[PDB]
Design a protein around this ligand. Structure first.
Ligand SMILES: OC[C@H](Cc1ccccc1)Nc1ncnc2[nH]cnc12
Length: 340
């Protein structure tokens, strides 16, 4: 039960614990499933002190328990105390994945073939997510779990939202953040992130590594060049479209100059994914149909959602006590004596 001066309490089913890269809300550890005769990953989460942590925990649980797809990480089991009073830390059991794209990029330059089929697997899972009317909102290499070159799964659905183009009023990982987010809930923001990931696979480094959001914008415009009047007019929040302007005018740096060693089809697709204007940005079914992925594209082998997702209760304004109860309810199916 003991792991590095801290209780884990995931017995007696899960044993032979071994500490691995710890998460944010608690920690992550490997374990042997005595029931399934295989090693698994267990994610200890203690979100109950703070409201946001409770949103992200509940968000990921509802989404992942409903989703069933080869390129999306699943939830095998949830370990938790019998009563609400007793539980402070939730345990989530998932398939063990050897590494992630972030780690893999630190150690290896990727071949065009490996990049191509990685890109396919991401978009395949994304197709499922978007067909369910769900946004991931935080795609990046570290959220792409890997076992082999043929085994990629998308994880961390804490920031996942149901799509809502008309939702106008916390933010995603900066380097992979779409320009419309920083200037003024659409599927286009996910394609942008993927574009950033594709660029990163092609050169083993972030394409837009800003220090903060204004600098993030400068990096983006530094490659794409100064936005047209067309793209300018779609910036609804003044002090942006009329912030800069002043705009040390920049020319569009050609993709083939940034990535001289890359497949021209990859750069073409990369170009469609990283278009400034979100309304002109390529969609997930179109990206899959792009020539660069023609050797893998197969609509008959790309499952979609049975029913477009909708949160039965809308969580944004609810207190952390109400969240704990909703978390308690959602995880009840994994408890002994569960009815209905
Ligand atoms: O790099 C991601 C790590 C990789 C890893 C695997 C074994 C030992 C050390 C490191 N795996 C996971 N990390 C977080 N959550 C998960 N769910 C399934 N696998 C993982």
């Amino acid at each position: 039960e003991m792991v590095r001066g801290q209780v884990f309490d995931v017995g007696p089913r899960y044993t032979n614990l071994s500490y691995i890269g710890e998460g944010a809300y608690g920690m992550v550890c490997s374990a042997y499933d005595n029931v399934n005769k295989v090693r698994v990953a267990i994610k200890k989460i203690s979100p109950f002190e703070h409201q946001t942590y409770c949103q992200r925990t509940l968000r990921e649980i509802k989404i992942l328990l409903r989703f069933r797809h080869e390129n999306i990480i699943g939830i095998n089991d949830i370990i938790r105390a019998p009563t609400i009073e007793q539980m402070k830390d939730v345990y989530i059991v998932q398939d063990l994945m050897e590494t992630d794209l972030y780690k893999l990029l630190k150690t290896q330059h990727l071949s065009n073939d490996h990049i191509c089929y990685f890109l396919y697997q991401i978009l395949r899972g994304l197709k499922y997510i978007h067909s369910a009317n769900v946004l991931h909102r935080d795609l990046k290499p570290s959220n792409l779990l890997l076992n082999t070159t043929c085994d990629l799964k998308i994880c961390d659905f804490g920031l996942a939202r149901v799509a809502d183009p008309d939702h106008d009023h916390y933010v995603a990982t900066r380097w992979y953040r779409a320009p419309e987010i920083m200037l003024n809930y659409t599927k286009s923001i996910d394609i942008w992130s993927v574009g950033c990931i594709l660029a990163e696979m092609l050169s083993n480094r972030p394409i837009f590594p800003g220090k903060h959001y204004l600098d993030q914008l400068n990096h983006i415009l530094g490659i794409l060049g100064s936005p047209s009047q067309e793209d300018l007019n779609c910036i609804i929040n003044l002090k942006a479209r009329n912030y800069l302007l002043s705009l040390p005018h920049k020319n569009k740096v050609p993709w083939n100059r940034l990535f001289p060693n890359a497949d021209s089809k990859a750069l073409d697709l990369l170009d469609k994914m990283l278009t400034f204007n979100p309304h002109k940005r390529i969609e997930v079914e179109q990206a899959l149909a792009h020539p660069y992925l023609e050797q893998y594209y197969d609509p008959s082998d790309e499952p979609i959602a049975e029913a477009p997702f909708k949160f039965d209760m809308e969580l944004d304004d609810l207190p952390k006590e109400k969240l704990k109860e909703l978390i308690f309810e959602e995880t009840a199916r994994f408890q002994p004596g569960y009815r209905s």
